[PDB]
Amino acid sequence: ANLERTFIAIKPDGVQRGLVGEIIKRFEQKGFRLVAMKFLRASEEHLKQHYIDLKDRPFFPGLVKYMNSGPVVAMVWEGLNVVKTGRVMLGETNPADSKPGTIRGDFCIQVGRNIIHGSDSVKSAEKEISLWFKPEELVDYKSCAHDWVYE
Amino acid sequence: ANLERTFIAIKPDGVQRGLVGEIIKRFEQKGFRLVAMKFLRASEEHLKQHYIDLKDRPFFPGLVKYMNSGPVVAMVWEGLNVVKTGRVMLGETNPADSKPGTIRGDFCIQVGRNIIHGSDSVKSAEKEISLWFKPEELVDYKSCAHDWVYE
Amino acid sequence: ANLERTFIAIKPDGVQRGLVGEIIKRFEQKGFRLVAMKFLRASEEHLKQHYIDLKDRPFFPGLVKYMNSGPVVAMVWEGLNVVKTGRVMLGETNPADSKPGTIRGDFCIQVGRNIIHGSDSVKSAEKEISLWFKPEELVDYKSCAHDWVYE
Amino acid sequence: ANLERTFIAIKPDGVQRGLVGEIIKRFEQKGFRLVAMKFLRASEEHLKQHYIDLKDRPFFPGLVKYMNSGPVVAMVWEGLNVVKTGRVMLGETNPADSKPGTIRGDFCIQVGRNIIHGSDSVKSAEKEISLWFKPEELVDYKSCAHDWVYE
Amino acid sequence: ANLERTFIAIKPDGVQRGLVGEIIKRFEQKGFRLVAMKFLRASEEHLKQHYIDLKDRPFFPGLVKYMNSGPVVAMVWEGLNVVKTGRVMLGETNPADSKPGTIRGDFCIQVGRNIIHGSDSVKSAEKEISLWFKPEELVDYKSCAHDWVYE
Amino acid sequence: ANLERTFIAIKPDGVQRGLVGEIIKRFEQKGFRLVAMKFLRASEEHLKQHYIDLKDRPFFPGLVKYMNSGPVVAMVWEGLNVVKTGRVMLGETNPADSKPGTIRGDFCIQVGRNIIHGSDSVKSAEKEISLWFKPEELVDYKSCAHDWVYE
Ligand SMILES: C[C@@]1(F)[C@H](O)[C@@H](COP(=O)(O)OP(=O)(O)O)O[C@H]1n1cnc2c(=O)[nH]c(N)nc21
Ligand SMILES: C[C@@]1(F)[C@H](O)[C@@H](COP(=O)(O)OP(=O)(O)O)O[C@H]1n1cnc2c(=O)[nH]c(N)nc21
Ligand SMILES: C[C@@]1(F)[C@H](O)[C@@H](COP(=O)(O)OP(=O)(O)O)O[C@H]1n1cnc2c(=O)[nH]c(N)nc21
Ligand SMILES: C[C@@]1(F)[C@H](O)[C@@H](COP(=O)(O)OP(=O)(O)O)O[C@H]1n1cnc2c(=O)[nH]c(N)nc21
Ligand SMILES: C[C@@]1(F)[C@H](O)[C@@H](COP(=O)(O)OP(=O)(O)O)O[C@H]1n1cnc2c(=O)[nH]c(N)nc21
Ligand SMILES: C[C@@]1(F)[C@H](O)[C@@H](COP(=O)(O)OP(=O)(O)O)O[C@H]1n1cnc2c(=O)[nH]c(N)nc21
């Protein structure tokens, strides 16, 4: 259970507004383990694949353009219930509903510029991880505080 | 909609306990735009006008004296749903009910020393803004990150 | 009422992961007064007394070993509703249910390594205080900001 | 001597990059007392007065345009040796020479976008104070921690 | 050499202005190990012993009264060159000369309210440690990141 | 001049001690632009190339083993004088000499576990960038605050 992983991506507005370090620190101080990280401008084709479920929504063309309009930080994090807990830490998808203390609650305002993405389930995490990273980009190491984080 | 404004005042206890910077930083990092700001000791007459709706409450004389007992920082902030979101960020009026992560939940304890004020509605914001500021004190400028905060 | 006290202990995992300063800062910034503090490795006998109600639970031997496996910071804090508010600040006993903004929600993952303890009631605070501190270790002084924190 | 005052202005780049709360917090946590504060777009004529000594420098037209290109936060701060210490806290005028730990050393890069101004001497502070504030904007109150800051 | 220790005391002004958490966090994040900690009001006799070398200085009566005027946090910290490094982190004894980034440079103003004490040499550390703590209050444990801090 | 780049690597001790977010935030808040980033366990052969100049030093086998003993965060950052400024922000190579306010001064103790690397010159930056990154990993975009950071 402690080996669960999620995909977290800082979107272009999070990069542009200078929020990368603050976001990583939230995951680090919680006790989760950084498995993978890269910085890139995601191609339109890649983003169409990421967002394939939405390909018919009216806002899809604009979503893909915005997500391609600057670089993103793509990450994988590991730990117990990291998918669900990761989502709690992000806050609600819509920042208007996100509580103070959460990433979106603290740092952004509108649903179209909501700074971050996290996997919504284990099954979507495994799909997003295979889409965004090569197997060799997932680094295997053990946190020095593992036994103080986990029974 | 993105042009809504609220009035936020740091009460004398907020000033005295050295919380001005911390409070401003919360609004800045969220993406709201500072429109106006001044520091003053509000007269008793001014405060009776600010609090006119409470003039019959038992606590009103003591409320006015406390609000006159040191300086306050008066501000106007702008953004989408700034009134309602501003109140969420402050926390509940009574600090005992305010959640961790909010301004009152993090920083104060009792309802009579609750460090900050925010407008409860658009209509009361517009009245409080006209009471506390001259129209020329409201500054018009565009945040450099506006297009990363709003679609 | 403003003289209520609670017992807070930073558990060995809290110490080990470098969270002592962060935790104390949360209580200080809120307006509570530090009454007593010591750093020690609690003996097994002491811990069995602290946790006497659980002496029959399956996890009790392991709980005691963990709580003896490094030092703890034992504190007393004072203020209005410090017991209940202290527990809100800590978050739920189980970190999986603790909200962002709380100590456990921000800093830990698993119920067996949940970094901190706070008294659950006035009556249990008074018992824990007499167990962990001598009366002469409780310091009486008045915070310089007391009249800005309390009516 | 403990009554000395300085003028500090957060320049339009400081406001645009969201540094107002961070800067104020540095002065507050040091133990200085905020005496006055306002937020305005300074007129070109006002700025030419502020910068009268430089009116012949090649960079003066550009300096005045930049200082008028967005709002500034104008402040007065009080305490022992606040002029000299204020300058130390800001860092060197040229951010390339400012040490880490200082405001310019932490937050900016180039001399023409150096985020903040502080009075260079007691006599220039008193001139800048009279230029930017009316005497009634200077608030008299005593910090609750004064006797823990000063012998 | 990695087993060197220093005595650090947060003075009454440091406690009263709510700096305890901040100060501890500086030592923890650096990689030093907390060995002992207690909170007390030091007696005048104890303080006269601590400050015996200064008993003839004109400021001595004032120094002793102030150091007795509220509680102090007494600590022992361990690590390589902790005495010298500890002093660098504190800053110069006189806050006017302390650089931004240091404890005194960031948080206090005058030499008689200079928030913190650190041992000036290994020999004075060992004397201060035996004066303020019993040998049994010094806790022996190994930090989980020790081998990431030391070769 | 404003297009200069440096290579910054957070070493395995920096990762293990949970300093990645904190370090990135220092570069972001200064005004530098993140150009590239990846997370990997560098091979022994790669590290021997990075450290080719030291291959005869007594500490070289241990340095390579330590640098291979966990993952590193490799980055490229851009801005005016980023190589020299980068070095000033890191502090001296030897943490014993690094000032408070710097990354090494704040966060580490010993030369063999000094948490971070930065290029010592433009020429070594260009060599390190070509060794650690492919050209296509270097992302070109323009900061939204560019004209508030640079004249
Ligand atoms: C913000 C989102 F990226 C979500 O992060 C993602 C997943 O769609 P959902 O929100 O249904 O689901 P999750 O948040 O994953 O639980 O689509 C986007 N999105 C959703 N609604 C809207 C909308 O009105 N406008 C725009 N511009 N983007 C929208
Ligand atoms: C503290 C307040 F200034 C509130 O900030 C404001 C509006 O508080 P309300 O409850 O009317 O409504 P809102 O939540 O603002 O919409 O009155 C005051 N106030 C309310 N109860 C008390 C009380 O017991 N003691 C005192 N000293 N002041 C009180
Ligand atoms: C974490 C706890 F110390 C609680 O902090 C304390 C009192 O927990 P209680 O159930 O008495 O109630 P509170 O919510 O505290 O008032 O026992 C422990 N504890 C409870 N369940 C478990 C468990 O599964 N595993 C382990 N290792 N420890 C557990
Ligand atoms: C940056 C400043 F706004 C300083 O804040 C102010 C006082 O800087 P001065 O050198 O006059 O003197 P002090 O540091 O106070 O002793 O002038 C400006 N300034 C100085 N050099 C330059 C320059 O090259 N380019 C530009 N654009 N502006 C410059
Ligand atoms: C602040 C100090 F506690 C120093 O920490 C310690 C020894 O001061 P020294 O500088 O001799 O030695 P250190 O560098 O400190 O180790 O007495 C105090 N002290 C020094 N000067 C003064 C002064 O003017 N006024 C007052 N009120 N107290 C002073
Ligand atoms: C810390 C370093 F990685 C420096 O980054 C790099 C170049 O050390 P240099 O001083 O040649 O140059 P820089 O200051 O780096 O640009 O060697 C390493 N290093 C230097 N001395 C020692 C030492 O005693 N022990 C160990 N374990 N490693 C050492």
Residue numbers in the entry:
A (entry chain F), B (entry chain E), C (entry chain D), D (entry chain C), E (entry chain B), F (entry chain A): 6 to 156
Quote the authors verbatim.
Bemnifosbuvir (AT-527) and AT-752 are guanosine analogues currently in clinical trials against several RNA viruses. Here, we show that these drugs require a minimal set of 5 cellular enzymes for activation to their common 5′-triphosphate AT-9010, with an obligate order of reactions. Crystal structures of human histidine triad nucleotide binding protein 1, adenosine deaminase-like protein 1, guanylate kinase 1, and nucleoside diphosphate kinase at 2.09, 2.44, 1.76, and 1.9 Å resolution, respectively, with cognate precursors of AT-9010 illuminate the activation pathway from the orally available bemnifosbuvir to AT-9010, pointing to key drug–protein contacts along the activation pathway.
NDPK is able to transfer a phosphate group from a triphosphate nucleoside donor to a nucleoside diphosphate acceptor, to yield the active triphosphate form of bemnifosbuvir AT-9010. The reaction proceeds through a so-called “ping-pong” mechanism in which a triphosphate nucleoside transfers covalently its γ-phosphate to the enzyme, and the diphosphate nucleoside acceptor is subsequently bound to the same site to accept the phosphate. NDPK shows a high conversion rate and is only 4-fold slower with AT-8500 as substrate than GDP (1,300 ± 100 nmol/min/nmol protein versus 5,400 ± 800, respectively). We crystallized the NDPK with AT-9010. A hexamer defines the asymmetric unit with 6 extra densities corresponding to 6 AT-8500 diphosphate. Interestingly, only the α and β-phosphates of the 5′-triphosphate moiety are visible. A new density is observed near the NE2 of His 118 of each monomer, which correspond to the histidine phosphorylated state His 118-P in Fig 3B (inset). The hydrogen bond between Lys 12 and the 3′-OH of the ribose is no longer present because of a displacement of the ribose, probably due to the 2′-C-methyl, 2′-F modification. This shift allows the 3′-OH to make direct contact with the phosphate group of His 118-P (3 Å).
